[PDB]
Design a protein around this nucleic acid. Structure first.
Lengths: 121, 209, 56, 114, 120
RNA sequence: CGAUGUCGGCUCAUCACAUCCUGGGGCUGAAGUAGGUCCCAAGGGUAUGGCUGUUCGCCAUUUAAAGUGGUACGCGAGCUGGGUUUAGAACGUCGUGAGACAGUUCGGUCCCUAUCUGCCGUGGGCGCUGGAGAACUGAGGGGGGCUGCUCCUAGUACGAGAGGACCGGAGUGGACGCAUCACUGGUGUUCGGGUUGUCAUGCCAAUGGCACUGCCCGGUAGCUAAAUGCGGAAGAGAUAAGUGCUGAAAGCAUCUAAGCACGAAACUUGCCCCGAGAUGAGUUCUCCCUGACCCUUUAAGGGUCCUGAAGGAACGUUGAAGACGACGACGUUGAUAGGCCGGGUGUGUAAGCGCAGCGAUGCGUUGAGCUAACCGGUACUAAUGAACCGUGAGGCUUAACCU
RNA sequence: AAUUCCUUGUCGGGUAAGUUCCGACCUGCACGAAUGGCGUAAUGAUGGCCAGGCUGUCUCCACCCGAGACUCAGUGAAAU
RNA sequence: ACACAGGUGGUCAGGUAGAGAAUACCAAGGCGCUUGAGAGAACUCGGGUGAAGGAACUAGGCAAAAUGGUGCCGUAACUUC
RNA sequence: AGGACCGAACCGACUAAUGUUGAAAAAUUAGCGGAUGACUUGUGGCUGGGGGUGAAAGGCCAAUCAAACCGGGAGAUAGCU
């Protein structure tokens, strides 16, 4: 979300803990994730998973401890920061299943597929 | 197109039927009384000088009392002017204020901003503070360099330094008109206008629109 | 931090042109006792506007 | 002021039931996907405001799929059309942040109009 | 900077302000007229007039509240027996500030603050 | 050399254009997308990290781009002190040695209360020609000037295919700036509560002091950003590079010599702010003052008595205004501040009593008590009438309008 | 390498990225055996590096509480 | 050089909590430190609290934050045991 | 038992900030090292300047040290200012 932020991982093939290394878009995007795409190195993984420990890829922020702002002024906050890992070129989700709730800001383009796999939106 | 003078009642929220909850500023705009009409014969320009509100007739001085005594005596809290360009409107003080804002869509609101007093460079401009702890003898929020040694030999005439912040006239432009109440003498506009509660606001139709 | 030339007595007086005391120039007179006082103050015998307020 | 709270009282809803912090409530909110709109239920314990007029908001904390989801709602918003009392809990304080940051600990129930 | 704020620091911290105004409120209730500075008289208005307003109603709880403030049983007894019913028909304004001269040791604007209806 | 503090970083910048991006063009070995090169153009913008003291460089990932230089290789009476050139010590090398290295390594005091100039703010005085109270005009001056992505046009023009537009619209972001506190939050030692140790109010109970606000838990107003609104434009005018029309000198040709038409984020305006000390001191509206003499060197005044006007200042109560001045509101014909009343808010069921329990404690009274800077009212307290300053019709010359 | 100029040697690990670090090679400019060589448990306000926790160190500052700075009265310097 | 935030040997050794001569609050006793009064700007000093992130700062985690007691369980490489 | 461990008095001085015309010609504040010993401290003595003393830095020898301070040679000398 910010650079050096350590996020949990919402999907399954993406594993365990990741670190944000760049906020994609913009000249100096400082602190940005609501359904925004960030650059990721992997700090912890599982042996089963499709991704290893220490490879760069993209992700989309799906849960944020800061929360989202609904148009009526209300807030949806979460306990902890989460992201869904994405490929570098096609920006498709690596994982096949999504864990935990996601938010209705995540409705553009590929995030249709993410919320289709998600349990609660 | 001319504007009106109101006062800032404060901010609140308009809940729309879709759940959009737009933030509004309430401006009490009482009826504006045209105390003077200035034309191209007496002056070099055409305008109307209006007044609004009321004054207690003992704080009205005799020059002010005579000026209000011409063109119908109801003293107001001040005097403002609006320059008028193409359309011709008749020259008596209006009965209902906001009926010319009833059909406009965006306004510019001018108000005297809230005074921050003597503000430093870090507050007044967005000056980066220096290091909190890595050495830094007595120099955290202070300005750093203010010039370039001998070759100028001076500070330039627009240098961002500390000084008075706020307490100045400032216009926020193209604010959406949310509601016009002729009966309550109210103009609800979307967003935040300059000044404190109870401060005078010059609200005019938008020039960018 | 220091001066390079001594400021003259002209510039000393120019700086002290605003260092000038102002007088009251208008003492109020109490309506019971005829003695004078500062405006909105006790009349130094224990009088305010018409009333003996402090016995001393 | 007097000009404001007239606008606030003509926008306020009178159907709001009585709630206290520690109560487990269910809130139905309108959600819109396309041209259709429907009701979605959010249920959990309450960290409320006390009534700030039109600008009133209650916090509801849920555990949905393993992690806590904390969501405030504006009380007089039109998206919040129904708030149901459900369970009625018994706590000693007004804000329950310390009593929510831990997991596996739940508020108790008492029947003295809590 | 300082907008819509009340309370004077008087160049001392909060515990000293509270203890100093407890002492000066007890002095005002004891003597019914005291001489202090003008800001310490206006802040004394803000401290003392709630005590007389509390003491208009005689209860054990009100006596203990007005003893938690000012910490003096003689001040509580005078405030609930002599004052109180004396100021019962009055709605505020139990004290009067009369501006006085200036202090000799430093140019302090002085003021006598006194109870408004003194029986003397 | 009777001292001009040295590299780099930080903070703050300002200029040049030999332009990195955006903008406008010519040629292309320019099909389109994407390039190459050159011309014009300085308005705005022009990364974050790993390593190293490093500028630089390499690397990772962005970006529309991560420009080149000047400014004592800008900036130490602004900061740091890692590098470098003090004194300690050691290694490699040289020297018999003391010691030495355009070699390395560990450690190693960075002073100054601003007089003048220059800036950033804010006042006092006088002037502006009778004196005031306002509202303005605008000569000037400053601010702002960035841009990505997506959709439509259109999978169209173009292209064998792959791919893929110009021109023109719409939405949504990034950075930046201004304003604000309705929301969401932070703070909230001036509000409420929990609790530890101790001391005190005779003791129980209840409180109060101190221990960083003792430690915390929330939190009003205000301030605030992370919050929320808005903004940089459109349009003109004159142009640069460039493209032309007509058109001779030169029967042709020719953008040019006469004439005419386009042409960029540059320039002048348009938007915002300051602004008549703009001494070139401007304009408009309104208000107030139209009494007796005396002395006289009269390119002229001075004095006495009577009268203080419009208005201002002072004093007080003060303010979402403020270092102080200044500015705003109010002063009894009064809501200006404090108090008071009612509400709101915020804590969270006070004290006392009764009951249950052996007791800690629980339950009822009781969403109780307390509650700020908030809101709506209310003359209870304080804003006293004098008094002070400022005068008494306002120069000369000329020209018009008047008898 | 407290020793290596070339040099940020080369290879491996750590990191998304590591002129420092650790393990090696030997091409030791210019290690080397009481000017002691190599290793070594414990010890160290010792030098370098990594990680967990932790945080205003920072993104990027915001508010508050005190002492000054500001105003008033009294006294009253200094370098130059 | 000062009515100077420094230095100066020995002796006495209360209560509560505490291992304690630590520390906190108090006894006996002694003081409020020889300029005050306001106001609540920048900036400096000394602190308190911070959303989300958590060393991205920097020469360097400098500084700050953190951990901190008693009893019991449990405890690695290596070792001169 | 221990030039043992933690930690006050006591002895010292590693880091940072403040102070740098200071409260102080080296201190204050927050931490920090030793704290039964090659410890620390009172009183008195002894060592005297090409000399002393030095767990060694050219450190220290009365705010003075690659040769103390005072007086004298002495008005040293100064191709320098």
């Amino acid at each position: 979300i910010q650079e050096q932020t350590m996020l949990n991982v919402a999907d399954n093939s993406g594993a365990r803990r990741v670190m944000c290394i760049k906020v994609l878009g913009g000249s100096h995007r400082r602190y940005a994730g609501v359904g925004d795409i960030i650059k990721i190195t992997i700090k912890e993984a599982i042996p089963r998973g499709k991704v290893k420990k220490g490879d760069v890829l993209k992700a989309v922020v799906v849960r944020t401890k800061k929360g989202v702002r609904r148009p009526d002024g209300s807030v949806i906050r979460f306990d902890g920061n989460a992201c869904v890992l994405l490929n570098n070129n096609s920006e498709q989700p690596i994982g096949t299943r999504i864990f935990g709730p996601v938010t209705r800001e995540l409705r553009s383009e590929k995030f249709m597929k993410i919320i289709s796999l998600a349990p609660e939106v | 197109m001319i504007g009106l003078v109101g006062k800032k009642v404060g901010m609140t929220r308009i809940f729309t039927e879709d759940g959009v909850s737009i933030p509004v500023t309430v401006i009490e705009v009482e009826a504006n009384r045209v105390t003077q009409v200035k034309d191209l014969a007496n002056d070099g320009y055409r305008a109307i000088q209006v007044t609004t509100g009321a004054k207690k007739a003992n704080r009205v001085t005799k020059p002010e009392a005579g000026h209000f005594a011409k063109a119908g005596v109801e003293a107001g809290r001040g005097l403002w002017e609006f320059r008028l360009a193409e359309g011709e409107e008749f020259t008596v003080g209006q009965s209902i204020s906001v009926e010319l804002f009833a059909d406009v869509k965006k306004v510019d609101v001018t108000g005297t901003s809230k005074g921050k007093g003597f503000a430093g460079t870090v507050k007044r401009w967005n000056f980066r503070t220096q290091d909190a702890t890595h050495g830094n003898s007595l120099s955290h929020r202070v300005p750093g360099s203010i010039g370039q040694n001998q070759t100028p030999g001076k500070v330039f005439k627009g240098k961002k330094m500390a000084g008075q912040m706020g307490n100045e006239r400032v216009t926020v432009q193209s604010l959406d008109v949310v509601r016009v109440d002729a009966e309550r003498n109210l103009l609800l506009v979307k967003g935040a206008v300059p000044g404190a509660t109870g401060s005078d606001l010059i609200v005019k139709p938008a020039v960018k629109a | 931090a220091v001066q390079q030339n001594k400021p003259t007595r002209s510039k000393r007086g120019m700086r002290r042109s605003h260092d000038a005391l102002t007088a009251v120039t208008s003492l109020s007179v109490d309506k019971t006792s005829g003695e004078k006082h500062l405006r909105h103050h006790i009349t130094a015998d224990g009088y305010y506007r018409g009333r003996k307020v402090i016995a001393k | 002021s007097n000009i404001i709270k007239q606008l606030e009282q003509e926008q306020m809803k009178q159907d709001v039931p009585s709630f206290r912090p520690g109560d487990t409530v269910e809130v139905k909110v309108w959600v819109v996907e396309g041209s259709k709109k429907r009701l979605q239920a959010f249920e959990g314990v309450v960290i409320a405001i006390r009534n700030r007029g039109l600008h009133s908001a209650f916090t509801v904390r849920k555990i949905s799929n393993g992690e806590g989801v904390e969501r405030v709602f504006q009380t007089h918003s039109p998206v919040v059309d129904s708030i149901s009392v459900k369970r009625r809990g018994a706590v000693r304080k007004a804000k329950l942040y310390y009593l929510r940051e831990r997991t596996g600990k739940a508020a108790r129930i008492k029947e003295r109009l809590n | 900077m300082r907008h819509r704020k009340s309370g004077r620091q008087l160049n001392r911290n909060s515990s000293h302000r509270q203890a100093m105004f407890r002492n000066m409120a007890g002095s005002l209730v004891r003597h019914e007229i005291i001489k202090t500075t003008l800001p310490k008289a206006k802040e004394l208005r803000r401290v003392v007039e709630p005590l007389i307003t509390l003491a208009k109603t005689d209860s054990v709880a009100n006596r203990r509240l007005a003893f938690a403030r000012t910490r003096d049983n003689e001040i509580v007894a005078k405030l609930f027996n002599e004052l109180g019913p004396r100021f019962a028909s009055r709605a505020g304004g139990y004290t009067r500030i009369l501006k006085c001269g200036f202090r000799a040791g430093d140019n302090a604007p002085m003021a006598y603050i006194e109870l408004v209806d003194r029986s003397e």
